[PDB]
């Protein structure tokens, strides 16, 4: 909260500057995730979407799409943005929350079974059956047990219980991320090294001032001739050249400047008549 | 759909369409030109019209083909890398081999990626360096074979008195027909491609429409035919396919003395004309370049160098080693065999 | 049929090879003379002697 407020001017706005928190625990597997602003200034909705797109439009970015089961899954904001950048659903992993909150007599079996809104990486269900200890603080062991019981006792999900719940999700993410890195480690190192050596040629580049002067002045000279005469190549299309403006002075301004100073008929006639 | 057939679609349907899509914004372009002719002249005067202003504008346009052309190479790289991954599912039973094979081939692709892109760029650079005026096509002074088949939803039909149905559409160089299903046993209609154009309907569904420029209704009593797809890439693919069939998408979006307007009008016709010549060449030429430098090369590589690479990288003793999943099934089958033979051997029909 | 296709190829090639010669040689030689030439002359022989 403090680091966020430190950066964000208004206490409700967003920022692209990331916060990098690493947690070591016996309750977690080796896994990394980038949490982003949830979908919902006045243009905040667009700011959030724009931020999300910066991340998810990248090919190597895997999408963990979270949607609540007690809603219209076809209208899931997460699934909709995921379909926008990953139409083939090949880099999107679905997560279904709030399964215990579904309307009586309904269930998300068809989605959990990867049949309704098919994704190659599949769907995983979870439930937050919050348990508090004596002190009133989060009790994860009891919570994870309540979730296990829920899937095992649900007639629609019992057959899938071993592929549902919090512990399982971490394993899948751990596996897929590892495989994703293995696939990307050869191509990433090459694409970066190629763009790297090109920069090295520029970084490495007394004796150099004299040669620079000559080149700099000559550059200046051709630039000047270019504006003032329209010599090749391709001149300019955005702004009027020097020589062209001068041309306007010569053949539009000067004539007009003369005419404006020119003797008027009445004052011309009196002067001459006086002379005769 | 196969990999190689898709490549043909990339070359002769996608690439053209990607090109067509980059809007000229001509009104702002014409301004650029008029500014350009005044700048070549400038400090000099009048007749005749700046030869170099024409060249100036064209070189701008040709440079703009680097984007859609490089993208094309990637779209080919995508289908190529997809295909090696498809083929190697038949070798999945050997984890270290499929891995190492994928590795070496994927590697080779990225090496070829450089060289093909370089040549693609260079080819376009060559085009800007010299702008030939002696081309015969420059200076004034098909088959009914199926182009594409797919399911589409007609959204245009009224919510009342009509309905919504999915049809199996068949597009050819002459018509666009739709059937009840992919068996093509019942043809509901066949619509001629003559004088047809394409417009995109305003924004979970993506719709687009065909309309006849020369008459009111394009099919039957319905003004225009609205077609929809569940994904955005699909409508972009269909629009590209129609382009191949010759139905283009409709374009829709002074103080100066009369002599300049004439001067701008002449050069404008020239730029449009020359680009036509260039576009034709490049649409033809970039595929051939990709074909030769990437597709044909990778193909030949796999046949000859791949086996050699596999041998050098590691001993044949190591890479054909592990196969636990096959072994687990076979171990189950091996125990299966000894058991089933004894089982039936004791039992009898009696 | 062959005559037709060759016509198509010839037109592209007749058009394109000058462009290639232009870009790889003429434009290259030109650019060399303007920038690299003087430096090479300086590097080559003593300015007093040449």
From Swiss-Prot, chain A:
Source species taxonomy: Eukaryota, Metazoa, Chordata, Craniata, Vertebrata
Annotated localization: Cytoplasm; Cytoplasm, Cytoskeleton
Protein family: Belongs to the TRAFAC class dynamin-like GTPase superfamily. Dynamin/Fzo/YdjA family.
Stretches assigned to the Dynamin-type G domain: 1-186
Task performed by this protein: Microtubule-associated force-producing protein involved in producing microtubule bundles and able to bind and hydrolyze GTP. Most probably involved in vesicular trafficking processes, in particular endocytosis.
Protein name as it appears in the record: Dynamin-3
Binding residues annotated for GTP, in chain numbering: 97-103, 128-131
Modified residues annotated as Phosphotyrosine in this record: 123
Region of interest: G5 motif: 127-130
Region (G4 motif) residue spans: 97-100
Residues of the full protein shown: 102 to 392 of 869
Positions carrying N6-acetyllysine: 191
Region of interest (G3 motif), ranges: 35-38
Swiss-Prot record, chain B:
Residues of the full protein shown: 356 to 745 of 869
Domain of life, per lineage: Eukaryota
Organism of this sequence: Homo sapiens (Human)
Cited function: Microtubule-associated force-producing protein involved in producing microtubule bundles and able to bind and hydrolyze GTP. Most probably involved in vesicular trafficking processes, in particular endocytosis.
GED domain span: 264-350
Subcellular location: Cytoplasm; Cytoplasm, Cytoskeleton
Modified residues (Phosphotyrosine): 219
Domain (PH): residue spans on this chain: 145-237
Region forming the signal peptide: none
Modified residues (N6-acetyllysine): 220
Family: Belongs to the TRAFAC class dynamin-like GTPase superfamily. Dynamin/Fzo/YdjA family.
Protein's name according to its UniProt entry: Dynamin-3
């Amino acid at each position: 909260e403090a680091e966020t407020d430190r950066v964000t001017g208004m206490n409700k706005g967003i920022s692209s500057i990331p916060i990098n928190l690493r947690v070591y625990s016996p309750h977690v597997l080796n896994l990394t995730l980038i949490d982003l602003p949830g979908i919902t200034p006045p243009d905040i909705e667009y700011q959030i979407r724009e931020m999300i797109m910066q991340f998810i439009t990248r090919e190597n970015c895997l999408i963990l799409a979270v949607t609540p089961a007690n809603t219209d899954l076809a209208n899931s904001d997460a699934l909709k943005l995921a379909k926008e950048v990953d139409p083939q659903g090949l880099r999107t992993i679905g997560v279904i929350t709030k399964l215990d909150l579904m309307d009586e007599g309904t269930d998300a079996r068809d989605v959990l079974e990867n049949k309704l809104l098919p994704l190659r990486r599949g769907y995983v269900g979870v439930v937050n059956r919050s348990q508090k200890d004596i002190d009133g603080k989060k009790d994860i062991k009891a919570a994870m047990l309540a979730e296990r019981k829920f899937f095992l006792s649900h007639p629609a999900y019992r057959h899938i219980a071993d592929r549902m719940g919090t512990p399982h999700l971490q394993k899948v993410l751990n596996q897929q991320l590892t495989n994703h890195i293995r696939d990307t480690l050869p191509n990433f190192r090459n694409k970066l090294q190629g763009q790297l050596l090109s920069i090295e040629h520029e970084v490495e580049a007394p004796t150099r001032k004299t040669k620079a002067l000559l080149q700099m002045v000559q550059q200046f000279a051709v630039d000047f001739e270019k504006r003032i005469e329209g010599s090749g190549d391709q001149v300019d299309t955005l702004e009027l050249s020097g020589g062209a403006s001068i041309n306007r002075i010569f053949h539009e301004r000067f004539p007009f400047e003369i005419v404006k100073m020119e003797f008027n008929e009445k004052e011309l006639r009196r002067e001459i008549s006086y002379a005769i | 759909l196969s990999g190689g057939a898709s490549i043909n679609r990339i070359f002769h349907e996608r690439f053209p369409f990607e090109i067509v899509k980059m809007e000229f914004n001509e009104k702002e372009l014409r301004r650029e030109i008029s500014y350009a002719i005044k700048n070549i002249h400038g400090i000099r005067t009048g007749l005749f019209t700046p030869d170099m202003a024409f060249e100036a504008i064209v070189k701008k346009q040709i440079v703009k083909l680097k984007g859609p052309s490089l993208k094309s190479v990637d779209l080919v790289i995508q289908e190529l890398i997809n295909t090696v991954k498809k083929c190697t599912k038949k070798l999945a039973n050997f984890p270290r081999l499929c891995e190492e094979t994928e590795r070496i081939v994927a590697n080779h692709i990225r090496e070829r990626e450089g060289k093909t892109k370089d040549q693609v760029l260079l080819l376009i650079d060559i085009q800007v360096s010299y702008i030939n005026t002696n081309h015969e096509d420059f200076i004034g002074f098909v088959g009914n074979q199926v182009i594409r088949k797919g399911w589409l939803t007609i959204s245009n039909i009224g919510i009342m008195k009509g309905g919504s149905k999915g049809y199996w559409f068949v597009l050819t160089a002459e018509s666009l027909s739709w059937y009840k299903d992919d068996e093509e046993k019942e043809k509901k209609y066949m619509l001629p491609l003559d004088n047809l154009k394409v417009r995109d309907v305003e924004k979970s569904k993506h719709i687009f429409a065909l309309f006849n420029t020369e008459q009111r209704n394009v099919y039957k009593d319905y003004r225009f035919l609205e077609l929809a797809c569940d994904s955005q890439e699909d409508v972009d693919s269909w629009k590209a396919s129609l382009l191949r069939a010759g139905v283009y998408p409709d374009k829709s979006v002074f103080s100066m003395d009369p002599q300049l307007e004439r001067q701008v009008e002449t050069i404008r016709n020239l730029v449009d004309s020359y680009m036509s010549i260039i576009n034709k060449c490049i649409r033809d030429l970039i595929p051939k370049t990709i074909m030769h430098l990437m597709i044909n090369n990778v193909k030949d590589f796999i046949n000859s160098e791949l086996l050699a690479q596999l041998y050098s990288s590691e001993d044949q003793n190591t890479l054909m080693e592990e196969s636990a999943e096959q072994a687990q099934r076979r171990d189950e089958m091996l125990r299966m065999y000894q058991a089933l033979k004894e089982a039936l051997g004791i039992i009898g029909d009696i």
